[PDB]
């Protein structure tokens, strides 16, 4: 008796916004019904429906923003990774794997060899 | 005040290290090839000992370079000086025996 998520993935944004308007009107009616009602199960369903509608709308907006910012060598901070303090900072892998050219020539000239003793 | 309750435990952990390091170093020994070196200090001057590293000149007398010898697992000390003949010769024989027993993968 409730909405599905995947059904809302197919819809256009105006269909989702009109569905939202419908659910808010349904909520406004169910409040008038619920001020007479001791227990109405339908309002608990429709608030979850409003939540899922907002989920699908926000998700489509965010993925549209990601697609328009896809090519650039930048991003809005909220769209970036969250990870923590200082995993933002202080190194990338490339900035840690980076080595001078002299030690590069040294490792080319004398790498750490593989040997087996007592043979 | 401190009591070494972990004396049993840490040894286990240490052998775990001696396991785990060995896992990465699977053919090679855990330790490098150290020199046999006679001790100072007349109380100990009859005692011979494990030294830190050999020298440049000794590794050249072994017939290789120290930069290559570190890749072979031979500990090398530049700041030591070879001043005794028999120490030098015995450690050269040690280097030769170590060269005899290794097989190196390309």
């Amino acid at each position: 008796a409730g909405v599905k998520a995947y059904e809302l993935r197919t819809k256009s944004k105006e269909q989702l916004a009109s569905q939202l308007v419908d659910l808010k009107k349904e909520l406004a009616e169910l409040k008038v019904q619920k001020l007479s009602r001791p227990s109405l199960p339908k309002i608990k369903t429709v608030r979850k429906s409003i939540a899922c509608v907002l989920t699908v709308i926000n998700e489509q907006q965010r993925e549209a923003v990601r697609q328009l910012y896809k090519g650039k060598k930048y991003q809005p901070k909220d769209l970036r990774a969250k990870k923590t303090r200082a995993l933002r900072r202080a190194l990338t892998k490339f900035e840690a794997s980076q080595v001078t050219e002299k030690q590069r020539k040294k490792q080319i000239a004398f790498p750490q060899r593989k040997y087996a003793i007592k043979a | 005040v401190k009591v070494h309750f972990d004396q049993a435990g840490k040894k286990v952990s240490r052998r775990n290290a001696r396991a785990t390091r060995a896992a990465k170093i699977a053919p090679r020994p855990l330790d490098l090839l150290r020199p046999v070196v006679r001790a100072p200090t007349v109380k100990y001057n009859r005692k011979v000992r494990a030294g830190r590293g050999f020298t440049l000149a000794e590794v050249k007398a072994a017939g290789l370079t120290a930069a290559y010898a570190r890749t072979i697992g031979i500990a090398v000390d530049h700041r030591r000086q070879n001043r005794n003949q028999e120490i030098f010769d015995a450690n050269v024989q040690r280097l030769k025996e170590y060269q005899s027993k290794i097989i190196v993968f390309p």
Binding site: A116, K118, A119 | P106
Partner: peptide, 19 residues
Amino acid sequence: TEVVKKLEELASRPVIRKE
């Protein structure tokens, strides 16, 4: 000795080198 012999063959194995 056996696996020593196997690794001795492997280190004794010439790699396919290029001039």
